[PDB]
C-alpha cells in the first residue's frame, strides 16, 4: 500500500487539553470544527468526552455527525443556525446555540419550541467578523431572557490579534466587552488558544481552545506556557525513488530548482492532495531517518523531493517526516508564509492512525 | 443547513474529455487521480465510462475504490506499486501498472502471477520525478519483454514545463524521449493537459489530461484551444452577516485590513477548511448575485469576509460564487500565487451537487 500515514496521538490530546484547565482554571469547550483540524472529529471527541465539560463546532452537521457516534456530551454551535428550520433539530438533539445577529434572534423569537435551548449571545468587540453592535447587545439580552424559548445565556466574543503579545488590541477588546456587559448578570466566554497561553489577566468562565489541544503554538515567538505543548499529528510517508544527478540539473515542474552542486535526489510518496503545502519552497526542513534535510522543487499533487546527498545511509524505504514531534508543523507552515491551522485542515486522503 | 455548497457539471467533463480526443486524435486516460482533483473520482468515472478509453490514479487504494463502485473500464496506477505484495491485488482486478524504478522490475521478475499484467515503462526525459535513465531504458524493455509476466508495454514520460509555451524544454524531452525508445516497437505516452491543449506535433498513442476534464487552463497566456474548455465545479456559499463600517475600522483576524472609507461589509459561509486559498489576498474577486467584487482580509477556517458597499441590493441570503463559470479558478489560484490544482483538491466537508 501507499507508505503515507497519518499518525494521530490521543494521549497527547488528552495532555493538551489538560492544560488549557490547568492554567485558566475554567470549563473548556474543545474546539473541533473542520474535522477536529483534520484530526478526526469523531475519534478526538471519544477521547475528550469522559473528561471534557463539551465540545464546539462550526455547523450543525459536524455536530450530528457526532450525535450519530455516541457522543453526548454538550455541543455548541459556533456558528449558530444558517437556516431557521435547523432549531427543531437543535432542540431534538439538545445543541448549545450562538447567536451573532439580529436576524437569528427574530426567528427564535418566532418559533414554537419544544423545550428551551442554551444561547450564546455573541459580541462584535473590535473583530468585525460576526456579532452583535454594542448598542444592541442589552437589548438583545432581555428579548431573549423573555422570550421563554431559551433556558441559559452566555456572552460571548472572539479576539482579533491575541496572537500578538506586544499588540494591546486585546485589552482593548475586552474593555468593549466588560463595558457592553456591565449590569447583566451573566457567564461569560472570551478565550481562545492564544488567550489562554498568553493572557492570564482576561476573564472566562468558559474558555475556546483550539489549536492548543493539537499541540501547535499560536505565537511567532517562544512562550513559556506554549512550550509545554506536545504535537499530536505526526505525518510521515517513505523514499519510493532515489536518483543520481550532476550540477545543473532541473527538478520537478517549472524546473524552479537547478542543482548547484552534484547531488543525491530522493523522492516522497506526499503531495499538495494529501494536504502537504505546496507554498513550501526549497529549504523546507524533514527529517529523514532521524537526521534533518531539506525539500527540493517543487511540491506535485502526490510526489515530492527532498535531499538525500548529505544522508549517506538513508534511500528506498527510509522513514520521512513532514511534520511531528521533530519538525514542528508551525516551522513548516512559517516556511510556506501561512499558519498551522491551515495546513492541519488540508489533510486528506491519508489513512488516520489512533493509538496513545 | 450550511449554505456551502459545490456544484459539478458532469455534461462539461463529458464535453472536456470529447475535446482532448477531438484535439489530439488518440486515446485518452482520464486522469482521476486525488478523487478526481477533488472532483469525486467515483461519480466522474462513471459518467465517462461508457465512451472513455481508461482512467488514471496514483495509487492502488485509489483504483481498488473505483472495482468496488464496479467501473471495470482499465485503470492504470501511475506510480505503480509501492510494495511488493500488491502484485496479486493488480493481477486480481487487471490494473495496468507503472514501472518508473528498477527495483520495482526486480520485484515483478522474481514473482509468479497468476496472469501476465501490462507495463507502462517510465522514463525520465528531464523533469528528473520519477523514471528510469535513458541508458537503463533498452535494458529494462527486454527484460519484461522475455519475462512471460508482462502481456503489454507501453513506453511513457512526463513532461516538466510542457505549460510554457515559449519553453523549448518540451522539445528536448521528446528528443531524449525518442533517442532511448528508438528500434523499439511499442506504443507511447507523453501528453498531459497543456500538451494536449498546445503542443500539436508532439506524438502520443495514449494522451493523459488531468486539468483540462475539470475546465481549467494550464496557461498563463490566453490560448485558442483552452478557451474551448467548461468549467466544471462551482464552489458557491451565502451572505450569513452584514455590517455597516466607518473609516479606520480593522477587519478579521491580524488586522490585515482596515476600511479606507465607510464601507459595508459581508460575511459569507466558506473557509479554508472548505478548500478556499488563504493565500487569497484582499482583492481577490467574487460575484455576489452577478456583479464583480472583492476579498477582503484574512479568510477564516470557516468564514470568509467580501465587499457589499458598491453592490446595492445584495444582503442576507446573496449566493456568492467562489470560482465557477463567471470566476474562474485560474483567476483565484493566480492570486493567491499557486495553480488551480491545489485549490481544486483542497476542497472538503462542503457536499457536492453532481448534475449537468
Given at each position: 500500500m501507499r507508505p503515507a500515514r497519518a499518525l494521530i496521538d490521543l494521549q497527547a490530546l488528552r495532555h493538551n487539553y489538560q492544560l488549557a484547565r490547568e492554567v485558566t482554571g475554567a470549563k473548556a469547550l474543545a474546539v473541533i470544527k473542520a474535522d477536529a483540524y483534520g484530526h478526526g472529529a469523531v475519534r478526538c471527541a471519544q477521547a475528550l468526552e469522559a473528561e471534557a465539560d463539551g465540545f464546539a463546532v462550526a455547523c450543525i452537521?459536524?455536530?450530528?455527525?457526532?450525535?450519530?457516534?455516541?457522543?453526548?456530551?454538550?455541543?455548541?454551535?459556533?456558528?449558530?443556525?444558517?437556516?431557521?428550520?435547523?432549531?427543531?433539530?437543535?432542540?431534538?438533539?439538545?445543541?448549545?446555540?450562538?447567536?451573532?445577529?439580529?436576524?437569528?434572534?427574530?426567528?427564535?423569537?418566532?418559533?414554537?419550541?419544544?423545550?428551551?435551548?442554551?444561547?450564546?449571545?455573541?459580541?462584535?468587540?473590535?473583530?468585525?467578523?460576526?456579532?452583535?453592535?454594542?448598542?444592541?447587545?442589552?437589548?438583545?439580552?432581555?428579548?431573549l431572557q423573555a422570550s421563554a424559548n431559551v433556558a441559559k445565556i452566555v456572552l460571548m466574543s472572539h479576539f482579533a490579534r491575541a496572537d500578538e503579545l506586544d499588540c494591546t488590541r486585546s485589552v482593548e477588546q475586552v474593555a468593549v466587552f466588560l463595558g457592553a456587559r456591565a449590569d447583566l448578570t451573566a457567564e461569560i466566554s472570551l478565550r481562545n488558544s492564544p488567550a489562554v497561553l498568553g493572557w492570564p489577566r482576561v476573564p472566562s468562565d468558559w474558555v475556546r481552545p483550539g489549536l492548543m489541544l493539537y499541540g501547535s503554538s499560536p505565537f511567532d515567538e517562544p512562550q513559556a506556557t506554549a512550550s509545554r505543548l506536545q504535537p499530536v499529528m505526526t505525518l510521515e510517508s517513505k523514499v519510493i525513488c532515489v536518483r543520481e544527478l550532476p550540477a545543473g540539473e532541473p527538478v520537478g515542474y517549472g524546473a524552479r530548482f537547478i542543482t548547484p552542486k552534484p547531488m543525491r535526489i530522493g523522492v516522497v510518496a506526499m503531495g499538495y492532495a494529501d494536504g502537504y503545502p505546496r507554498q513550501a519552497p526549497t529549504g523546507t526542513p524533514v527529517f529523514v531517518d532521524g537526521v534533518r534535510s531539506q525539500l527540493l522543487g517543487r511540491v506535485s499533487m502526490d510526489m515530492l523531493c527532498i535531499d538525500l546527498t548529505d544522508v549517506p545511509q538513508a534511500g528506498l524505504g527510509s522513514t520521512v517526516e513532514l511534520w511531528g514531534k521533530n519538525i514542528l508543523a508551525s516551522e513548516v507552515a512559517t516556511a510556506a508564509d501561512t499558519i498551522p491551522y491551515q495546513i492541519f485542515c488540508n489533510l486528506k486522503r491519508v489513512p488516520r492512525l489512533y493509538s496513545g
Open positions: 452537521e459536524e455536530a450530528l455527525e457526532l450525535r450519530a457516534a455516541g457522543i453526548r456530551a454538550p455541543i455548541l454551535l459556533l456558528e449558530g443556525f444558517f437556516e431557521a428550520d435547523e432549531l427543531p433539530l437543535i432542540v431534538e438533539h439538545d445543541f448549545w446555540c450562538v447567536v451573532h445577529s439580529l436576524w437569528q434572534l427574530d426567528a427564535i423569537e418566532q418559533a414554537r419550541l419544544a423545550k428551551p435551548i442554551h444561547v450564546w449571545l455573541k459580541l462584535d468587540s473590535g473583530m468585525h467578523r460576526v456579532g452583535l453592535h454594542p448598542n444592541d447587545y442589552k437589548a438583545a439580552y432581555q428579548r
